[PDB]
Coordinates of C-alpha atoms and ligand atoms in Angstrom, one line a residue:
Chain I
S1 CA -1.7 -214.8 149.0
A2 CA -2.9 -216.4 145.4
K3 CA -0.1 -219.3 145.8
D4 CA -1.2 -220.5 149.2
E5 CA -5.1 -220.0 148.0
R6 CA -4.4 -222.0 144.8
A7 CA -2.5 -224.6 147.1
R8 CA -5.8 -224.6 149.3
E9 CA -7.9 -225.7 146.1
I10 CA -5.7 -228.6 145.3
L11 CA -6.0 -230.1 148.9
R12 CA -9.2 -229.4 149.0
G13 CA -10.3 -231.1 145.4
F14 CA -8.5 -234.1 146.4
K15 CA -10.0 -237.7 147.3
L16 CA -8.7 -241.0 147.9
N17 CA -11.8 -243.3 146.8
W18 CA -10.5 -246.4 147.6
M19 CA -7.4 -248.9 148.2
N20 CA -6.9 -252.5 147.9
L21 CA -5.0 -255.7 148.6
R22 CA -5.3 -258.9 146.0
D23 CA -3.5 -261.8 145.8
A24 CA -1.1 -261.5 143.0
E25 CA -1.0 -265.1 141.8
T26 CA -4.7 -264.9 141.5
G27 CA -5.6 -261.4 141.3
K28 CA -8.8 -262.1 143.8
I29 CA -8.8 -259.3 145.9
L30 CA -8.2 -259.8 149.5
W31 CA -9.4 -256.9 151.0
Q32 CA -10.8 -253.1 149.9
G33 CA -11.8 -250.3 152.0
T34 CA -13.6 -247.6 150.4
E35 CA -15.5 -244.6 152.2
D36 CA -13.6 -241.9 153.6
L37 CA -9.8 -243.1 153.7
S38 CA -9.1 -239.8 154.5
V39 CA -11.4 -238.6 156.8
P40 CA -11.0 -236.7 160.3
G41 CA -11.7 -238.5 163.9
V42 CA -11.5 -242.1 162.0
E43 CA -8.4 -244.7 163.0
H44 CA -8.9 -246.0 159.5
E45 CA -8.2 -249.5 159.4
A46 CA -8.5 -252.8 157.3
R47 CA -9.6 -256.2 158.3
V48 CA -7.9 -259.1 156.1
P49 CA -7.6 -263.1 155.7
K50 CA -3.9 -263.5 157.5
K51 CA -3.8 -265.9 154.3
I52 CA -1.8 -262.9 153.3
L53 CA 1.1 -263.3 155.2
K54 CA 1.8 -266.5 152.9
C55 CA 1.2 -265.1 149.6
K56 CA 4.5 -264.6 147.8
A57 CA 3.0 -261.5 145.6
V58 CA 0.6 -259.1 146.9
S59 CA -0.6 -256.4 144.3
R60 CA -2.2 -253.3 146.8
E61 CA -3.9 -250.6 144.4
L62 CA -5.0 -246.8 144.8
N63 CA -7.5 -244.7 143.2
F64 CA -7.9 -241.3 143.9
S65 CA -9.5 -237.8 142.1
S66 CA -8.2 -235.0 141.4
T67 CA -10.6 -231.9 140.7
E68 CA -7.6 -229.1 140.2
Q69 CA -4.5 -230.3 137.9
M70 CA -1.0 -231.0 139.4
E71 CA 2.5 -230.9 137.4
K72 CA 4.7 -232.7 139.8
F73 CA 2.0 -235.2 141.7
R74 CA 3.6 -238.2 143.4
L75 CA 3.3 -241.0 146.2
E76 CA 5.0 -242.4 149.0
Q77 CA 4.1 -245.1 150.6
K78 CA 5.0 -246.7 154.0
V79 CA 4.7 -249.8 155.6
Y80 CA 5.5 -250.3 159.1
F81 CA 5.6 -252.6 162.1
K82 CA 5.9 -250.3 165.1
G83 CA 8.8 -248.6 164.1
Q84 CA 10.8 -251.1 161.6
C85 CA 10.5 -250.9 157.9
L86 CA 8.4 -253.8 156.2
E87 CA 7.9 -251.8 153.1
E88 CA 8.6 -248.2 151.4
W89 CA 7.2 -247.3 148.0
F90 CA 7.7 -244.4 145.7
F91 CA 6.2 -242.8 142.4
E92 CA 6.2 -240.2 139.8
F93 CA 3.2 -239.8 138.3
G94 CA 3.9 -236.3 137.4
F95 CA 1.0 -234.5 135.5
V96 CA -2.5 -234.9 136.8
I97 CA -5.6 -233.8 134.6
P98 CA -8.4 -231.6 135.9
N99 CA -11.3 -233.7 137.3
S100 CA -9.7 -237.1 136.8
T101 CA -10.2 -239.9 138.6
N102 CA -6.7 -242.6 138.6
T103 CA -5.9 -245.3 139.8
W104 CA -2.4 -246.9 141.0
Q105 CA -0.9 -250.4 141.5
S106 CA 2.2 -251.9 142.6
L107 CA 3.3 -256.0 142.4
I108 CA 4.4 -256.2 146.5
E109 CA 7.1 -259.3 146.5
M110 CA 6.1 -262.7 162.2
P111 CA 3.6 -264.5 163.0
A112 CA 0.3 -262.9 162.9
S113 CA -0.5 -261.6 166.7
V114 CA 2.6 -260.0 167.0
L115 CA 1.5 -257.8 163.6
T116 CA -2.2 -257.9 163.7
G117 CA -2.5 -254.6 164.7
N118 CA 0.7 -252.9 164.5
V119 CA 0.8 -252.6 160.6
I120 CA 0.4 -249.5 159.3
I121 CA 0.5 -248.4 155.9
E122 CA 1.3 -244.8 155.7
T123 CA 0.2 -243.1 152.2
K124 CA 1.5 -239.7 151.5
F125 CA 1.2 -237.8 148.1
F126 CA 2.3 -234.6 147.3
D127 CA 2.5 -232.1 144.6
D128 CA 6.2 -231.5 144.1
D129 CA 6.8 -230.5 147.8
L130 CA 3.3 -229.8 148.7
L131 CA 1.7 -231.9 151.1
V132 CA -1.7 -233.2 149.6
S133 CA -2.9 -235.6 151.6
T134 CA -1.9 -238.4 154.2
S135 CA -3.3 -241.5 154.6
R136 CA -2.8 -244.3 157.6
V137 CA -4.6 -247.5 157.5
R138 CA -3.4 -250.1 160.5
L139 CA -4.1 -253.9 159.4
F140 CA -5.5 -256.5 161.4
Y141 CA -5.2 -259.9 160.3
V142 CA -8.2 -261.8 159.8
Chain Q
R1 CA 16.2 -250.3 134.1
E2 CA 12.6 -250.2 134.6
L3 CA 10.6 -249.5 131.4
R4 CA 8.0 -247.6 131.1
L5 CA 5.3 -248.4 128.1
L6 CA 2.5 -245.6 127.2
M7 CA -0.7 -247.2 125.9
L8 CA -3.1 -244.9 124.3
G9 CA -5.7 -245.6 121.6
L10 CA -9.0 -244.0 120.8
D11 CA -11.5 -244.6 123.6
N12 CA -13.4 -247.9 123.8
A13 CA -10.5 -249.9 122.2
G14 CA -9.8 -251.9 124.9
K15 CA -6.7 -250.8 127.0
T16 CA -8.2 -251.0 130.3
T17 CA -9.2 -254.5 129.8
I18 CA -6.4 -255.5 128.0
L19 CA -4.2 -254.1 130.7
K20 CA -6.7 -255.6 133.8
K21 CA -6.5 -259.3 131.5
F22 CA -2.7 -259.6 131.6
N23 CA -2.5 -259.0 134.9
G24 CA -4.9 -261.9 135.7
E25 CA -7.6 -259.5 137.2
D26 CA -11.2 -259.8 136.7
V27 CA -12.5 -257.4 133.5
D28 CA -16.4 -257.3 133.4
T29 CA -16.5 -254.4 136.0
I30 CA -14.6 -252.2 133.5
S31 CA -15.8 -248.7 133.1
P32 CA -14.1 -245.5 130.9
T33 CA -10.7 -244.2 132.0
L34 CA -11.4 -240.5 132.5
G35 CA -7.6 -240.2 133.7
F36 CA -5.0 -242.9 133.7
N37 CA -4.7 -246.6 135.3
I38 CA -1.1 -247.1 136.6
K39 CA 0.2 -250.7 137.1
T40 CA 3.6 -251.2 138.1
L41 CA 5.1 -255.0 137.6
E42 CA 7.7 -257.7 137.0
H43 CA 7.4 -259.7 133.8
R44 CA 9.9 -262.2 132.6
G45 CA 12.7 -260.3 134.7
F46 CA 11.7 -256.6 133.3
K47 CA 10.4 -254.5 135.9
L48 CA 7.9 -252.4 134.0
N49 CA 5.5 -249.0 134.9
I50 CA 2.4 -249.3 132.3
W51 CA 0.3 -246.4 132.0
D52 CA -3.1 -246.7 130.2
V53 CA -4.4 -243.2 130.0
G54 CA -7.7 -242.5 129.0
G55 CA -8.6 -241.9 125.2
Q56 CA -11.8 -239.9 125.3
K57 CA -11.5 -237.1 122.7
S58 CA -11.2 -234.7 126.2
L59 CA -8.5 -236.8 127.3
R60 CA -6.1 -236.7 124.5
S61 CA -5.0 -233.1 124.9
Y62 CA -3.1 -234.5 127.8
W63 CA -1.7 -237.7 126.8
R64 CA 1.6 -235.5 125.7
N65 CA 1.9 -234.8 129.2
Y66 CA 3.3 -238.3 129.7
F67 CA 5.5 -238.7 126.4
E68 CA 9.0 -237.9 128.8
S69 CA 10.9 -241.6 129.1
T70 CA 8.5 -243.4 127.1
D71 CA 10.5 -246.8 125.8
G72 CA 7.6 -248.8 124.4
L73 CA 4.3 -247.3 122.4
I74 CA 1.3 -249.7 122.7
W75 CA -1.3 -248.3 120.6
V76 CA -4.6 -249.9 120.5
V77 CA -7.2 -250.6 118.1
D78 CA -11.0 -251.9 118.1
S79 CA -10.0 -253.8 115.2
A80 CA -14.0 -253.9 114.4
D81 CA -14.9 -250.1 114.6
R82 CA -14.0 -249.9 110.9
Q83 CA -16.0 -246.5 111.2
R84 CA -12.9 -244.6 113.3
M85 CA -10.1 -246.5 111.9
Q86 CA -9.2 -243.5 109.9
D87 CA -9.2 -240.6 113.3
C88 CA -7.1 -244.0 114.6
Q89 CA -4.8 -243.5 111.7
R90 CA -4.7 -239.2 112.2
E91 CA -3.9 -239.8 115.9
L92 CA -0.9 -242.7 115.8
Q93 CA 0.9 -240.5 113.2
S94 CA 0.8 -237.8 115.2
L95 CA 1.9 -239.4 117.7
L96 CA 5.1 -241.1 115.4
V97 CA 6.3 -237.3 114.8
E98 CA 6.3 -236.5 118.3
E99 CA 10.7 -235.6 119.6
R100 CA 9.8 -236.8 122.7
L101 CA 8.0 -240.2 121.9
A102 CA 11.5 -241.0 118.8
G103 CA 13.3 -244.4 119.6
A104 CA 10.0 -245.5 121.3
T105 CA 9.2 -248.9 120.1
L106 CA 5.8 -249.3 118.9
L107 CA 3.5 -252.5 119.1
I108 CA 0.3 -252.0 117.5
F109 CA -2.3 -254.4 119.2
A110 CA -5.6 -255.1 116.5
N111 CA -7.8 -256.1 119.3
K112 CA -11.1 -257.2 119.8
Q113 CA -10.5 -260.0 116.8
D114 CA -13.0 -262.2 119.1
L115 CA -15.5 -259.7 117.3
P116 CA -17.2 -260.8 113.7
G117 CA -16.2 -257.8 111.9
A118 CA -12.8 -257.2 112.8
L119 CA -10.6 -256.4 110.2
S120 CA -7.5 -258.7 109.4
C121 CA -3.9 -257.3 110.7
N122 CA -3.0 -256.4 107.0
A123 CA -6.2 -254.5 106.8
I124 CA -5.3 -252.6 109.5
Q125 CA -1.8 -252.4 108.7
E126 CA -2.7 -250.9 105.6
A127 CA -5.4 -248.4 106.7
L128 CA -2.6 -247.3 109.6
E129 CA -0.1 -246.4 107.2
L130 CA 2.0 -249.1 109.0
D131 CA 4.6 -249.6 106.2
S132 CA 5.6 -246.2 106.1
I133 CA 6.6 -245.8 109.7
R134 CA 10.2 -245.8 109.6
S135 CA 11.3 -243.8 112.6
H136 CA 10.5 -246.4 115.2
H137 CA 10.4 -250.2 115.2
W138 CA 6.9 -251.5 114.9
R139 CA 4.8 -255.0 114.9
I140 CA 1.0 -255.3 114.7
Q141 CA 0.0 -258.1 117.0
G142 CA -4.1 -259.3 116.4
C143 CA -5.8 -259.7 120.0
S144 CA -9.0 -260.3 122.5
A145 CA -8.3 -258.8 126.0
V146 CA -12.0 -260.5 126.8
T147 CA -10.3 -264.0 126.2
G148 CA -6.6 -263.0 126.8
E149 CA -5.5 -264.3 123.6
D150 CA -2.2 -263.4 122.0
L151 CA -1.7 -261.0 124.2
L152 CA 1.5 -262.0 126.3
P153 CA 3.1 -262.7 122.4
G154 CA 2.9 -259.0 122.1
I155 CA 3.6 -257.8 125.0
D156 CA 7.1 -260.2 124.9
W157 CA 8.0 -258.3 121.5
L158 CA 7.8 -255.4 122.7
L159 CA 10.3 -256.1 125.7
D160 CA 12.9 -257.9 123.5
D161 CA 13.0 -255.5 121.3
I162 CA 13.0 -252.2 123.9
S163 CA 15.6 -254.7 126.0
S164 CA 17.7 -254.5 122.4
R165 CA 18.2 -251.2 122.7
Ligands
GDP1 N1 -15.9 -258.7 122.4 C1 -14.5 -257.7 123.0 N2 -14.9 -256.6 123.8 C2 -13.5 -255.8 124.1 C3 -12.4 -256.6 124.3 N3 -12.0 -255.0 124.8 C4 -12.9 -254.8 125.6 N4 -13.7 -254.7 125.0 C5 -15.0 -253.8 125.4 O1 -15.0 -252.5 125.3 C6 -15.6 -251.9 126.1 C7 -14.2 -250.6 126.2 O2 -13.3 -251.5 127.0 P1 -12.5 -250.9 127.4 O3 -11.1 -251.9 128.4 O4 -12.6 -250.4 128.7 O5 -11.7 -249.2 127.1 P2 -10.6 -248.3 127.0 O6 -11.2 -247.5 126.6 O7 -9.7 -248.5 125.1 O8 -10.1 -248.5 128.3 C8 -16.1 -252.8 127.1 O9 -17.6 -252.7 127.3 C9 -15.0 -253.8 127.2 O10 -15.6 -255.1 128.2 C10 -12.4 -257.6 123.2 O11 -11.1 -258.0 122.9 N5 -13.8 -258.1 123.1
MG2 MG1 -9.9 -247.5 130.0

């Protein structure tokens, strides 16, 4: 159907270029992952300085591209420790310009051996209710 | 509630540098915005969603898709680009008569005041016809996004005015 064909164009034209973590207080990037964050057969992971666990303020930034125009774009980001919720963010972008590259950033306010390897940042992007892309990044402190 | 601030202006006005400078981030590797740059943060107890949308000619036609629910409009001007000062004026006045932006507080950032040929605030106030503006509370604030000088005075006023509504 035309509708299914259009949604395939949307999915095919979307790309999460990079994601990073900054110490909000200083504005210094603690870790930034780039290359194919949403590529198959790869358990995306991040080696971030454990000192981030001492930051009272952390900012997380995302940069994504979309060849196709979208009308009700939004993202759902949840950070888990196994099954428990550490964080959950939502954001309605709405309109996304065709052939655009965009950035979104939020200022976010247990040991390290227990966390490391057991922390996942799951980002889901939707256009109304069409799942455009899913991203999982397992965190390792230091 | 969260406040939504929409930052627009011609390309090269310095919108992105102002936003990064304001958040204490490096502003030496800033490139043209080909879409939007959104920062969600808290300042003085306010939770803000600041939308820096690209100002290239090709992108302005999409600006209107982000007008809904805007509490404050931040219009950034390159104080040293006297050339496009007329186009700048027309774009702004066009925005001021938009229905989905009615009541929104207006902050005019006369940016790049660190540059030699930077027009005064009075000059920009005249060139942009701000005195005729009467459908929106407004204030012009000269500033420098590279040094960060006077960015807060502008933002702080904007938040105080919006909250009083
Ligand atoms: N000297 C000086 N340069 C600035 C200032 N603000 C921005 N720039 C420079 O102007 C260019 C465009 O800035 P940018 O923030 O990307 O503009 P935007 O197009 O409005 O997002 C970049 O080369 C910036 O480093 C300022 O206040 N003073
Ligand atoms: Mg920009």
